[PDB]
């Protein structure tokens, strides 16, 4: 199994899980989405160890098993230093690959913008360089939703009545349409969702739900900066991704040399909807840039 540990990182105790590859060829660091989720829903990327790729999972500040730091530290810039601190505290001066999903991708970009010198490659799956853009795009998704659920999200949404069952059905439908297109959501995914609903980070940095981004990052946007990323970048996105491929396009358009792969018939959690295709894509990318 993977080697887990609860070591002090950048001041606070963080939880990380290192899964070493039998014949290691590259170290891949992962950043879960949210803010407030956990590494749990990214475990599917573990398969890559079978491809000589060591994968490092870890719960960010206030997430999963890691401890919650002062609320003044609930920032993307903070997560970056946390990541760097973890990357050096575990691998030292070794250049690794960084992957980020959803908010984790945005975080991955932020990190890459400052610490790309420590990276051999950047992977952004369903990530974003601008929240407003992401919001401008999710609103469109809600409008394209069958009125039944659209009116509900818009009705109880303005009254902050997220507890209402009618609003729930809509949030459920939307999720099964742009978050994970499948009947049986895997435990790992439900665990990460459960975690975000039990900790504070999600409520403070993101907001009520997946498309109600009213938290402290509602205005985050580093699009006019990501252009500085010169390292090999692989940007993926699902056809029906809640963080639309158009949002991915913006990242691709800036990062020169970057690749943009849209997973057809996939949504946000493409690592589960197409675990084999998704993993093969990432592993092939990494190995081609050792
Ligand atoms: N909270 C969702 C989508 C999202 C991420 C980041 C910002 C806004 C929305 C996720 O990470 O799966």
Swiss-Prot record:
Any one Pfam family match given in the protein's UniProt record, by short name: Abhydrolase_1
Listed PANTHER family: HYDROLASE, PUTATIVE (AFU_ORTHOLOGUE AFUA_2G14860)-RELATED (PTHR43798:SF33), MONOACYLGLYCEROL LIPASE (PTHR43798)
Record: active site: 102 (nucleophile), 241, 268 (proton donor)
Keyword vocabulary terms for this entry: Aminopeptidase, Hydrolase, Protease
Recorded superkingdom: Archaea
UniProt source species: Thermoplasma acidophilum (strain ATCC 25905 / DSM 1728 / JCM 9062 / NBRC 15155 / AMRC-C165)
Name of the featured protein: Proline iminopeptidase
NCBIfam families: pro_imino_pep_2 (TIGR01250), ProImpepThrmp (NF045948)
GO annotation, biological process: proteolysis
Reaction(s) catalysed (UniProt annotation): Release of N-terminal proline from a peptide
Gene Ontology molecular-function annotations: aminopeptidase activity
InterPro entries, sorted: AB_hydrolase_1, AB_hydrolase_fold, AB_hydrolase_sf, Peptidase_S33, Pro_imino_pep
Subunit structure: Part of the tricorn proteolytic complex.
Function of the protein: Cleaves H-Pro-AMC as well as a wide spectrum of amino acid substrates and several peptide substrates without a proline at the N-terminus. Proteases F1, F2 and F3 degrade oligopeptides produced by Tricorn (themselves probably produced by the proteasome) yielding free amino acids.
Gene Ontology cellular-component terms listed: membrane
Similarity comment: family membership: Belongs to the peptidase S33 family.
Enzyme Commission number(s): 3.4.11.5
């Amino acid at each position: 199994e993977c080697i887990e540990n609860y070591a002090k990182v950048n001041g606070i105790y963080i939880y990380y899980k290192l899964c070493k590859a039998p014949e290691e060829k590259a170290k891949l660091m992962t950043m879960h989405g949210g803010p407030g989720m956990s590494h749990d829903y990214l475990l599917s990327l573990r398969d890559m160890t079978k491809e000589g790729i060591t994968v490092l999972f870890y719960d960010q500040f206030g997430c999963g098993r890691s401890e919650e730091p002062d609320q003044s530290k609930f920032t993307i810039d903070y997560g970056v230093e946390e990541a760097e601190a973890l990357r050096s505290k575990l691998f030292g001066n070794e250049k690794v690959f960084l992957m980020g999903s959803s908010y984790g991708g945005a975080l991955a970009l932020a990190y890459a913008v400052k610490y790309q010198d420590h990276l051999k490659g950047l992977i952004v799956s369903g990530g974003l360089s601008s929240v407003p853009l992401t919001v401008k795009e999710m609103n469109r998704l809600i409008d394209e939703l069958p009125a039944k659920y659209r009116d509900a999200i818009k009705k109880y949404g303005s009254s902050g009545s997220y507890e209402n069952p009618e609003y729930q059905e809509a949030v459920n439908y939307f999720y099964h349409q742009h978050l994970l297109r499948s009947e049986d959501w895997p435990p790992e995914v439900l665990k990460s969702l459960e975690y975000a609903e039990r900790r504070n980070v999600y409520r403070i940095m993101n907001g009520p739900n997946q498309f109600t981004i009213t938290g402290t990052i509602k205005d985050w946007d580093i699009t006019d900066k990501i252009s500085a990323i010169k390292i090999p970048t692989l940007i993926t996105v699902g056809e029906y991704d809640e963080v639309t491929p158009n949002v991915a396009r913006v990242i691709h358009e800036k990062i020169a040399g970057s690749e943009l792969h849209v997973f057809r018939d996939c949504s946000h959690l493409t690592m589960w909807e197409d675990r084999e295709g998704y993993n093969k894509l990432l592993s092939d990318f990494i190995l081609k840039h050792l």
